[PDB]
Design a protein around this ligand. Structure first.
Ligand SMILES: Cc1cc2nc3c(=O)[nH]c(=O)nc-3n(C[C@H](O)[C@H](O)[C@H](O)COP(=O)(O)OP(=O)(O)OC[C@H]3O[C@@H](n4cnc5c(N)ncnc54)[C@H](O)[C@@H]3O)c2cc1C
Ligand SMILES: Cc1cc2nc3c(=O)[nH]c(=O)nc-3n(C[C@H](O)[C@H](O)[C@H](O)COP(=O)(O)OP(=O)(O)OC[C@H]3O[C@@H](n4cnc5c(N)ncnc54)[C@H](O)[C@@H]3O)c2cc1C
Ligand SMILES: N[C@@H](CCC(=O)N[C@@H](CS)C(=O)NCC(=O)O)C(=O)O
Ligand SMILES: N[C@@H](CCC(=O)N[C@@H](CS)C(=O)NCC(=O)O)C(=O)O
Ligand SMILES: [Ca+2]
Ligand SMILES: [Ca+2]
Lengths: 588, 588
């Protein structure tokens, strides 16, 4: 596979140097390029097992087998004397700049995946442009560079989650000896939002500075792929232009869905609006049962809010359903109200948002339960969390030939390639892939390395760990119990489980036998860990390390041999013994 | 090794049944034993690869090769018909009770290791006694069942640590929008102590109930091994008696050291006294630089205390010294004062503890710095944390023949056996072993299984993860950087590292570039992870999962391929790229 690898690498790399760590002529070229401020990829052949074979294969491209060999956009440009010739004649800058296209890479979308791909490509001398545009929500909310996670996703969600957790810290404080009057303590929504938004602002600015420092052209513009290599751009002044690029990365993400009911778009809000909302939501209805719905409902209740969640059928569809029930039970026990087996019919406005006192309006929500009984209740705020959708009709001309699935997501190969061979898709729009920030980032970085630095490594989308940041957090890595049983049969599945209690909860008088963990294992494969699940505080911190072990093919024996750290919650994974089949209670 | 294994198993097991899962005669015996309330170990031969060989070998003990075969204390007692014969004749209870000794196992020490070993042995029908006695501290402090971790160690330490962390949660709360008057908030030491001690009380009681429920004889008595099988006991009424046991487990732990200076024993306190201290310590001097010293100094400062730490030479000797410096730097930056290169000479009393108002006394501490300058300062409380020591002269007669090392710890084989073959040592007194609670527990449980259930599994003492619960926590698994370099040479070591910042610290306006992590790797062994180190909040929760991966022989590649969970602190381990040799700054 050496010949195939080199053919691909030479064809795709923007500026690449084939080198050896011990060669003085290679160092001379490296020093020249560094002085000339020419960024490039470097392949050290003496550090590869097939390095000798690569040298021989290079002759098919350069007619020489020696090092160094420099290539620019598919063409051999010279050995050490030749590169220094260009340098001494003021020709080098022009040569390493010659291109058929404006850019080696155009990234459409300045979110998690797009920024990661763009920055990484620039490192290897790919002339890169990143396009980002945020179409305003129906009520007019917009934000800066960084995409969903930075502005209206993971970052503000976790910060508001923390504000909520601090409510319970205030309660715990008394039991640990702290003297305070909780009856005189209140939360100010707008002060929290201002703090959150100040941090988001530093991230917006941070990414702009990063792109500048990486010599990436940032355009705050709407991009449209009109042919394989042509991107139509519309700027802030509505001026339309066309730029060209060799490789294109589609990383445009998704936006919240709205139910097709009267009043939904006019009066409801989504997560897009919530995180910069100038007024306190007040009495809130969340319509939906996604992790987004439950996370938002969760922190609103902890901030003292009157919160109701309207659930069509089940919670967290796709997630382990035992764990999902436990997540919901905790929320219900702590004041989140659930309108079960219930759907909305219409939203009517009873009061407009006060824009000078920053107070919410009032809405009438009409719906019905499956039993036929009517739902009719007043809420100050209605939040829709009924899923998210790609919007590639706004990004992609149909004549380009990029294939989309029934859901409107891009059908990709295992190296992120679309049906148009120079066009790639990463992040939430990549059909079938886990829709998470670190996945988008890994995909973008690994892709950029393959395109421009001769890397071979593909992104591994299997056993990607997750955490739902509900009031009691839920971390998971691998298969749900039901999926493992479906795949391998009940007779081949063993489940080890236990309740636990954080030491911190003892003095604080919190619940016994609520925090919970399980390992789903395959009996015939040396008790291989197929799935890990934990409900408890800091579940993300607990889960992460185990994801490495699971990647390596951890068995129950590996967990058993490892010694716990005491006192922690995570140590409970090291001493599990109660099986579900035994019928023994998991209580402690 | 089948013959050797069976010989050992038959010789050592108290009550054991050799069985097959498919055999109806085996089920009959199991049902008889369960009805008769006879606990026993069971070996299912059809579940072992060498099961057929074991059947043949059993004939050397029983003259039969069939299942079931029941053994009591080294003797074949019968097949299925024979066991049922004993049962129908009211003979079975007497037979399974026949013994040369009072107990199959006597555990001296009712702490982490001892309780774990005792409870586990009883499960397999070993007649077990657990002895525990707490010799009072010089000022008279004593406590209940459960040992060091439960009463004067991990448990109260972490709870007071949490009380300290809640101080900073109160600060963070304001930035997250919570309205409170911090100028009117104070901490009450005694209220905290009462809460902590209430939980310790439930653990004391919990362990007593557990021993009762496992049919373990608990004696609140001082034990002394006077011969291999004879233990002299002294009860609360000073009455002296002798009990006999087949196997003996020494699990007597350690107690705090005092420096040999005037006033030390009379006026100073240790961790033994601190966790139930009826008065607030007030202005405090901690003498020592162990994890105990720094943990205690740490939480006292967070509870608003005026705290000084006297350090002879370095912090956390034995731990990674870069990490140790970072731990100390954080503490110093947050108000813990350090008296560096300083030793104490004498403690003089200036005021006696007020026993009715629960207020501290006052002490004058005189010392000297290495530069010759005098140390003279008044403190309300002086705490010694200058190490811990075994006290086996109080437990062990010299004529028994149990070998101790220069430090007074028991020299053991890799299966915890002392130089007296029926006598074993576990926990802190086992020479050379990591002195941690889960280690003692694993050792005790695994030993009990080997002795009484035919297990082969040894305790793995390598790469045992740790966490120091200082104000900023420090988690580690594996080798320090300096130890890795010493072992393999600097040229074979690569260190990947990064600063990070908890998302929670952003809005709270806490430090950039203080939290830190590194992976110490071996270049020639596919970048094998030799050591993992993390400074940051919840470092124990972060570290634990990775300890499984390290046990399995994780490489840098395994970390790289694993996807992060966002937003967490732990995810930073999945994207490390900056090496120490490159000289690139780890700042973010
Ligand atoms: C409320 C919420 C909470 C979440 N929490 C987590 C979490 O805790 N952990 C986690 O891992 N994931 C979380 N996620 C998911 C995570 O946000 C996404 O997986 C990630 O942001 C996807 O990044 P992306 O690069 O694919 O697209 P995005 O981050 O959405 O970026 C795409 C960008 O491209 C822009 N764009 C669209 N069309 C064009 C165009 N025509 N021209 C130019 N620009 C365009 C978009 O406006 C956007 O700025 C959360 C999501 C939500 C909604
Ligand atoms: C302040 C402090 C904090 C710590 N924090 C942690 C931590 O966070 N995590 C961690 O893993 N480890 C921690 N440790 C260490 C941990 O406590 C010990 O490793 C563990 O308790 C050792 O248990 P053990 O069974 O060996 O002995 P112990 O728990 O000490 O139990 C021995 C018992 O035997 C009794 N005894 C002694 N002599 C006799 C006799 N002659 N007859 C009858 N009984 C006798 C003793 O009084 C004691 O009750 C901490 C230790 C200290 C001091
Ligand atoms: N004339 C060549 C010099 C090539 C050369 O002398 N390089 C040596 C390494 S120092 C080489 O490639 N030798 C053969 C090999 O390494 O296999 C140039 O200017 O680049
Ligand atoms: N007489 C024996 C019965 C032994 C017997 O029939 N057991 C069968 C299993 S059901 C057996 O050991 N067969 C030989 C084997 O399993 O290898 C007893 O009372 O224990
Ligand atoms: Ca274990
Ligand atoms: Ca990774």
């Amino acid at each position: 596979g050496t010949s195939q690898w080199l053919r691909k690498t030479v064809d795709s790399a923007a500026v690449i140097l084939f080198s050896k760590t011990t060669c003085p002529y290679c160092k001379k070229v490296k020093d020249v390029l560094a002085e000339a401020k020419i960024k490039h990829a470097t392949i050290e052949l003496d550090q590869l097992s097939n390095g000798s074979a690569i040298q021989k294969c290079l002759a098919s491209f350069s007619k020489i087998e020696t090092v160094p060999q420099m290539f620019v956009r598919g063409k051999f440009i010279g050995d050490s004397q030749t590169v220094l010739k260009y340098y001494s004649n003021d020709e080098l800058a022009g040569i390493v700049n010659e291109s058929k296209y404006d850019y080696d890479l155009i990234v459409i979308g300045g979110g998690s995946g797009g920024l990661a791909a763009g920055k990484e490509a620039a490192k290897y001398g790919a002339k890169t442009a990143v396009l980002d545009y945020v179409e305003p929500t129906p009520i007019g909310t917009t934000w800066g560079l960084g995409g969903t996670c930075v502005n209206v996703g993971c970052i503000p969600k976790k910060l508001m989650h923390q504000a909520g957790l601090l409510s319970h810290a205030l309660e715990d404080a008394e039991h640990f000896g702290w003297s305070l009057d909780r009856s005189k303590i209140s939360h100010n929504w707008s002060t929290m939002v201002e703090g959150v938004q100040s941090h988001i602002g530093s991230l917006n600015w941070g990414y702009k500075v990063a792109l500048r420092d990486n010599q990436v052209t940032y355009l705050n513009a709407k991009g449209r792929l009109i042919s394989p290599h042509e991107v139509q751009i519309t700027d802030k002044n509505q001026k339309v232009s066309t730029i060209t690029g060799n490789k294109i990365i589609l990383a445009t993400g998704e936006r919240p869905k709205y139910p097709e009911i009267p009043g939904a778009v006019e009066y409801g809000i989504t997560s897009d609006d919530l995180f910069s909302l100038p007024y306190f939501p007040g009495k809130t209805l969340v319509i939906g049962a996604s992790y987004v719905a439950l996370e938002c409902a969760g922190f609103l209740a902890s901030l003292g809010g009157d919160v109701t969640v309207m659930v069509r059928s089940i919670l967290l569809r796709g997630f382990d359903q035992q764990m999902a029930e436990k997540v919901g039970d905790y929320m219900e026990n702590h004041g989140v109200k659930f309108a079960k087996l219930c759907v909305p019919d219409e939203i009517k406005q009873l009061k407009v948002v006060d824009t000078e006192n920053n107070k919410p309006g009032l809405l009438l929500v009409k719906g019905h339960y499956t039993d036929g009984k009517k739902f009719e209740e007043e809420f100050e705020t209605v939040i829709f969390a009924v899923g998210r959708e790609p919007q590639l009709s706004k990004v992609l001309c149909e004549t380009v030939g990029v294939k989309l699935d029934k859901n409107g997501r891009v059908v990709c190969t295992d190296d992120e390639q679309t049906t148009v061979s120079n066009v790639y898709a990463i992040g939430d729009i990549n059909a079938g892939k886990p829709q998470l920030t670190p996945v988008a980032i890994q995909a973008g970085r690994y892709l950029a390395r393959r395109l421009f630095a001769g890397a071979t490594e593909l992104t591994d989308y299997s056993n990607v760990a997750t955490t739902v940041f509900t009031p009691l957090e839920y971390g998971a890595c691998g298969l749900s119990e039901e999926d493992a049983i479906e795949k391998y049969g009940d007779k081949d599945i063993e489940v080890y489980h236990s309740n636990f209690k954080p030491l911190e909860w003892t003095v604080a008088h919190r619940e016994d036998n609520v925090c919970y963990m399980k390992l789903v294992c395959r009996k015939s494969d040396n008790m291989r860990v197929l799935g890990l699940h934990v409900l408890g505080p800091n579940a993300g911190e607990i889960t992460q390390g185990y994801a490495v072990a699971i990647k390596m093919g951890a068995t129950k024996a590996d967990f058993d041999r490892t010694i716990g750290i005491h006192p922690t919650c995570s140590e409970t994974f090291t001493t599990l013994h109660v099986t579900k089949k035994s019928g023994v209670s998991p209580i402690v």
